[PDB]
Symmetry: C2
Subunit: 93 residues, 2 copies
Amino acid sequence: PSFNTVRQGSKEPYPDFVARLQDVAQKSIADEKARKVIVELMAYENANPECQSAIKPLKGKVPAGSDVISEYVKACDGIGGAMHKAMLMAQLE
Amino acid sequence: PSFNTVRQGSKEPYPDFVARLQDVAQKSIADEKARKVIVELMAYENANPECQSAIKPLKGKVPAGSDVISEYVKACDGIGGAMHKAMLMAQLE
């Protein structure tokens, strides 16, 4: 398929959802930039509807010099149990 | 936000959904490749759940030398009225 079409399933571990996002983006991409930009992007666009919803505030915002994935996984760092379903109505909105 | 976070709304015209997808990807990206790859990718990942669903068969497959968007818009070229809602159960699945 695409590289990055790999996406967070039922509360799939986020740093892992994106780690394979990057992995195969890396397998299919020779451009680190296109690799990152799509891992860091699909991290939202491809993530769980709640998890990208954890991400939308960070969406576009990355710390200067840091990885956006780090933050996007940090976004869903609260998603995976209980808080996932509390935030489901807030973030997924 | 991102560049490409612009996505097909309620049966939003697809070549147009992605044309702005590309536009702002172009505004925010200096790399034509990262521009294309994300327009051609978000063309699915960001498209309408039916329209990307029009795209999944083309997802990853582009004609040698052609734009994938051309095909992805062609995918939703049947989406926008009537067939959209027929295909809604098939493609969105």
